[PDB]
Design an enzyme around this catalytic site. Sequence first.
Site, PDB file in Angstrom:
ATOM      1  CE  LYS A  92      28.329  66.877  -5.354  1.00  0.00           C
ATOM      2  NZ  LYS A  92      28.251  68.299  -4.912  1.00  0.00           N
ATOM      3  CB  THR A 141      24.886  68.986  -7.479  1.00  0.00           C
ATOM      4  OG1 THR A 141      25.802  69.888  -6.864  1.00  0.00           O
ATOM      5  CG2 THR A 141      24.397  69.706  -8.742  1.00  0.00           C
ATOM      6  NE  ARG A 195      48.046  42.943 -36.727  1.00  0.00           N
ATOM      7  CZ  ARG A 195      47.222  43.931 -37.007  1.00  0.00           C
ATOM      8  NH1 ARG A 195      47.618  45.062 -37.552  1.00  0.00           N
ATOM      9  NH2 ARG A 195      45.926  43.759 -36.719  1.00  0.00           N
ATOM     10  CD  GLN A 203      39.474  47.210 -39.196  1.00  0.00           C
ATOM     11  OE1 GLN A 203      40.322  46.484 -38.689  1.00  0.00           O
ATOM     12  NE2 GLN A 203      39.787  48.334 -39.818  1.00  0.00           N
ATOM     13  CG  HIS A 253      50.199  50.317 -33.654  1.00  0.00           C
ATOM     14  ND1 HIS A 253      49.417  49.459 -34.411  1.00  0.00           N
ATOM     15  CD2 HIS A 253      49.653  51.540 -33.780  1.00  0.00           C
ATOM     16  CE1 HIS A 253      48.443  50.152 -34.962  1.00  0.00           C
ATOM     17  NE2 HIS A 253      48.550  51.418 -34.610  1.00  0.00           N
TER      18      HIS A 253
HETATM   19  O1  LIG Z   1      43.668  45.406 -37.788  1.00  0.00           O
HETATM   20  C1  LIG Z   1      44.058  46.432 -38.307  1.00  0.00           C
HETATM   21  N1  LIG Z   1      43.143  47.308 -38.841  1.00  0.00           N
HETATM   22  C2  LIG Z   1      43.372  48.509 -39.462  1.00  0.00           C
HETATM   23  O2  LIG Z   1      42.460  49.196 -39.885  1.00  0.00           O
HETATM   24  C3  LIG Z   1      44.783  48.815 -39.561  1.00  0.00           C
HETATM   25  N2  LIG Z   1      45.360  49.883 -40.071  1.00  0.00           N
HETATM   26  C4  LIG Z   1      46.652  49.687 -39.858  1.00  0.00           C
HETATM   27  O3  LIG Z   1      47.596  50.455 -40.188  1.00  0.00           O
HETATM   28  N3  LIG Z   1      46.938  48.514 -39.214  1.00  0.00           N
HETATM   29  C5  LIG Z   1      45.700  47.958 -38.986  1.00  0.00           C
HETATM   30  N4  LIG Z   1      45.390  46.778 -38.385  1.00  0.00           N
HETATM   31  O1  LIG Z   2      25.656  76.839  -8.760  1.00  0.00           O
HETATM   32  C1  LIG Z   2      25.275  75.813  -8.236  1.00  0.00           C
HETATM   33  N1  LIG Z   2      24.380  75.007  -8.902  1.00  0.00           N
HETATM   34  C2  LIG Z   2      23.833  73.818  -8.491  1.00  0.00           C
HETATM   35  O2  LIG Z   2      23.052  73.198  -9.190  1.00  0.00           O
HETATM   36  C3  LIG Z   2      24.272  73.441  -7.166  1.00  0.00           C
HETATM   37  N2  LIG Z   2      23.969  72.362  -6.474  1.00  0.00           N
HETATM   38  C4  LIG Z   2      24.677  72.479  -5.362  1.00  0.00           C
HETATM   39  O3  LIG Z   2      24.698  71.673  -4.392  1.00  0.00           O
HETATM   40  N3  LIG Z   2      25.444  73.612  -5.308  1.00  0.00           N
HETATM   41  C5  LIG Z   2      25.203  74.225  -6.515  1.00  0.00           C
HETATM   42  N4  LIG Z   2      25.700  75.398  -6.992  1.00  0.00           N
HETATM   43  C1  LIG Z   3      44.985  50.132 -36.549  1.00  0.00           C
HETATM   44  N1  LIG Z   3      44.390  49.110 -36.348  1.00  0.00           N
HETATM   45  C1  LIG Z   4      27.051  72.006  -8.203  1.00  0.00           C
HETATM   46  N1  LIG Z   4      27.060  73.052  -8.791  1.00  0.00           N
END
Ligand SMILES: O=c1[nH]c(=O)c2[nH]c(=O)[nH]c2[nH]1
Ligand SMILES: O=c1[nH]c(=O)c2[nH]c(=O)[nH]c2[nH]1
Ligand SMILES: [C-]#N
Ligand SMILES: [C-]#N
Lengths: 295, 295, 295, 295
Positions: free
Chosen positions: C10, C57, C176, C228, C256
């Site tokens: 779920k 589920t 910058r 980096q 940017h």
């Molecule tokens: O901090 C930055 N890292 C990058 O790898 C990068 N590449 C870029 O065009 N600007 C920047 N600035």
């Molecule tokens: O096709 C389904 N699978 C599940 O595992 C499930 N669990 C549920 O509550 N309804 C459904 N329906």
């Molecule tokens: C691009 N940092």
């Molecule tokens: C719940 N499928």
Amino acid sequence: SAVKAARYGKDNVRVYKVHKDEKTGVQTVYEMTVCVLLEGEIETSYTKADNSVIVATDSIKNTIYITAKQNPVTPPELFGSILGTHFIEKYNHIHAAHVNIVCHRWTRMDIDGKPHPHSFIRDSEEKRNVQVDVVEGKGIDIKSSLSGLTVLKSTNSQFWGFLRDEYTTLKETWDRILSTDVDATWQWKNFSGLQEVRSHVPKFDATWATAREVTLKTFAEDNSASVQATMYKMAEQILARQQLIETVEYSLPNKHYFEIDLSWHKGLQNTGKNAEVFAPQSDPNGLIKCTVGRS
Amino acid sequence: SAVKAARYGKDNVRVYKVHKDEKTGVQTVYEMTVCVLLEGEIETSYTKADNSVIVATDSIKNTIYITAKQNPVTPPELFGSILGTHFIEKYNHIHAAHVNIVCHRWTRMDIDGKPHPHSFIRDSEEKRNVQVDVVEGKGIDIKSSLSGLTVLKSTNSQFWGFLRDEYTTLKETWDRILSTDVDATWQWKNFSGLQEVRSHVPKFDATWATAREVTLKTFAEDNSASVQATMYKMAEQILARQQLIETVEYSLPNKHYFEIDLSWHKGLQNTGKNAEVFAPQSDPNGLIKCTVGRS
Amino acid sequence: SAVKAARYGKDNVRVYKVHKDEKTGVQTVYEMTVCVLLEGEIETSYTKADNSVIVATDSIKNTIYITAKQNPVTPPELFGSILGTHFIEKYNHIHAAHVNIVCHRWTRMDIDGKPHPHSFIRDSEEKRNVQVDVVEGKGIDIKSSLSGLTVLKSTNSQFWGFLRDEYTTLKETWDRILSTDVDATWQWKNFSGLQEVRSHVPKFDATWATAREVTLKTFAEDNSASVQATMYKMAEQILARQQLIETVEYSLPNKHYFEIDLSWHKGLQNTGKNAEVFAPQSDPNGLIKCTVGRS
Amino acid sequence: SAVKAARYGKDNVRVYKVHKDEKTGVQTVYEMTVCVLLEGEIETSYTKADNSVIVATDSIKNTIYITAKQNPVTPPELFGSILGTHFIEKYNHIHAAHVNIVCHRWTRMDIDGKPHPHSFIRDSEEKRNVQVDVVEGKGIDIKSSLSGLTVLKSTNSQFWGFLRDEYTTLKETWDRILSTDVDATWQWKNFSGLQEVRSHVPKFDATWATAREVTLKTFAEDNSASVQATMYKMAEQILARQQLIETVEYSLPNKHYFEIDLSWHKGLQNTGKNAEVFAPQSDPNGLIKCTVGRS
Ligand SMILES: O=c1[nH]c(=O)c2[nH]c(=O)[nH]c2[nH]1
Ligand SMILES: O=c1[nH]c(=O)c2[nH]c(=O)[nH]c2[nH]1
Ligand SMILES: [C-]#N
Ligand SMILES: [C-]#N
Ligand SMILES: O=c1[nH]c(=O)c2[nH]c(=O)[nH]c2[nH]1
Ligand SMILES: O=c1[nH]c(=O)c2[nH]c(=O)[nH]c2[nH]1
Ligand SMILES: [C-]#N
Ligand SMILES: [C-]#N
Ligand code: NA
Ligand code: NA
Ligand code: NA
Ligand code: NA
């Protein structure tokens, strides 16, 4: 202090509905997200803690599911009208209902060239929406829309002849990329109530289709002089194909694609007629809007 | 302290490329988002501020555009191989290049039943991706994938026979909705280098097609006993249709749709066989994964 | 075909827990998002529709809430260990549990200079996380992290002396902006089981504090030669202040901020020492990673 | 067809500005996102491809940077007024400027209990915003707001006495969790122009502070009868502390936290007074709005 305005309700209510043809075995699904805001004589909830005037938003939620259970959810214009009408008819002190709906795509899958009876695909994030205002004594006002329709044309777009002053650096161009996300809204003549909305039910789907169709064709075929020019032509046509529409609104971002000068690198030619690789720009973007009505 | 591992590069590099057929007048567009991470003898950049070992990420950006200008960008498996090979061949101290690419959809528009020469639509948010690892002395490792393929079937899904103890409340079901977002990965046999990747270029597009086709058909036709069962059947088939694939990985959320008991309301019947309106659940969700290989 | 690997569970399980001091009246809240993936003898669920091996589920969901009800949810390293241990101890065929937890901030509000007993604020989107792997026969492996810690310094960042070739256009700079979103992970010595994790419980909160404290101070005071160099110094210090840590991982985007040449406008000077207004770039971004261990 | 309304401009313009105290050495940073939409005699751009009436959105972008270079960017109400005034004064045919600004947090870091001269943290995603309408002949209309202020109180929230009918299932409660994301707007008396806005410059920061302060204190101390009641009390107070405000608007989602009945499990008591572990609900949510003015 005094309350000038107040509205409350439930937002983001996801709803699914399935239709099962007992005969053909064909199933059809509908999914939407619903929002409902109510207005009326509810001011005392805010000023004196009088909750008696409040239809719990939890209850509004329940009512959305119940209305979907008891009525068709399509076309959304109709469902929204039915839902808004419920609230103002049911609650004496509730005088307005606003219903907003987002319709999600579940397109039927084609398997081996054959439409499948119960399997679907979210074929795009494009939505169909409605905004429905049900007002006691003032009928039903409906705005319909498509949104999230993302398009691009690689040529046949231009922009020259714009104002130039000391603030201007943009170069005129006779050949550029044009890309946008289409938000188109068509606003309907007021309806007197649910009967009138029901009498026109076919026109909703038909007018949505038309709006989409005209949008795409105009975008694709217009040798655009600008976003402004192109969008007016779309709105023009839609208004001419459905008389029950009063206005058409477009809101279009210009999603810019910049040329990349690579001449610094081994004399690489990638500008103008040699432009091949572009830098799509996430922001900023031009934003162009217009509401077109009848002369 | 000592550097155990280090990698650096440029992420989220949007790239567009257009192809223009001078003869037919047909244009074709490609858009992707590229990420490139390099490894090698770069540890001194981290420990002693030795930037001489650094190929600026700005320069990696430039190189992405230049490589796109000088080479086809399709299929992405090839472009990624070309790009990764560049870095380890160009820089003596760079011994590994990881290239991740997201391919965005620009489907050619059909206007009046006719394919348009330069207008496109983002027909879905579904992506095609590649992960390419170019390692000096160890060749080229490629993982291909589709993701964001959103599907739903309204019936022909089941889940019964699961473990039941004091932690269990889920009821067995013989008829439920199944919806998911498909993330499918096919991992290729190691390639000795660019020549070998180029010799297989047709198989990339063909294997993507197959993976998508098999995914959709299996989803649509399998009267699923569970997500687990259904996804294995997909992986099974893909492995049988392309020998150059070693493994197939699926990661599938179970996007739950809950029934809504409305019997509290005027005896409304909306459960079991009468189930019509459902509550889509945004969270939580089951998550089911498997990697299938050859016996 | 054969299953090479399989895991299921779920995801996106939101959990809130409140502590109420009956005496002081002080309440304390905890909110997290939990993900649990199980491995074991479950392959038959995939190959033969054998659901007997499946702990639903839905049931996993229930168990998350029940474990939170019966045990402290803090520190998350402990809760995750307890939860993972449950699954491998409870189910004979379940041999591994992976537990991922995102801890959300609910900082107690200060009202009129006084800490409020039950009102809180999401003071930042920064998260504290844990990744806990409980493996039968192999103990408990825990990785702790902070993420979404967004910082900027306006000066005392530099980047010169990087490789320059025909692919290079970036100018060297001695002043910058440096901005990033800090993702820092500290990986703990293997634990034999829950007893050993419990014996160290104080060190989890203390080591998180240290990691955050060292990150911020190093970022603020280092006249950085590059991302980096600066990040190694952070990892260096953390390793020296907590012996039970084996490695420290940093993943830092370089978000940017571009200078804007406005000299075209009335000789406006906005570059170099006159740089005042900058264009934050949403994409692309440099991405710098390193794992530092003990010599 | 006829144009009923039209507006166009640049959206999503990210802007950074640094202030450097030459004497103290203290630097101060500002970051915002700006949107500018213009109205005027521009209809011919849409109907006849007359771009002469268009101030290119690219140029609007340039002007934003230039205005930020030549004027203080704080308080945002002032900057927006200056920017809007520029456009209607500069262009004869431009009769309205709408300026929307989102102010991003860059809080100065405290290192070893000491405020750092040039290192900052995005201490929350909470925004301060302005909406400024500069209309030729109608002065300057300004709406100020805070948004994304996410809060939770664990007790001292109630909801009973609401309407109950056949649509109602929600149980009354005298003790619940209340959590929301605060969107509060204060609307200023019309200003005649830039002189009047400048004369009040101190009140903008002071009124923002007040709005935030009153919001948090009211939320924390009000033994809330409902969201409606609590929010009116906030709006009440703000109106009483700043006479130049005409209205105060609140829009508050009710971000529900559901109790979890675990009595099915070994008689576990987790409801009512024993409620400890809750299920945060992502959707749907109640939405409560009100505009408060002066009696
Ligand atoms: O901090 C930055 N890292 C990058 O790898 C990068 N590449 C870029 O065009 N600007 C920047 N600035
Ligand atoms: O096709 C389904 N699978 C599940 O595992 C499930 N669990 C549920 O509550 N309804 C459904 N329906
Ligand atoms: C691009 N940092
Ligand atoms: C719940 N499928
Ligand atoms: O179609 C366009 N309309 C504009 O208003 C404009 N402004 C701009 O810079 N480019 C464009 N393109
Ligand atoms: O404060 C609240 N107001 C409402 O209008 C409402 N509606 C609801 O279901 N719960 C709440 N809570
Ligand atoms: C801008 N269009
Ligand atoms: C709902 N409040
Ligand atoms: Na009414
Ligand atoms: Na090399
Ligand atoms: Na076990
Ligand atoms: Na003017």
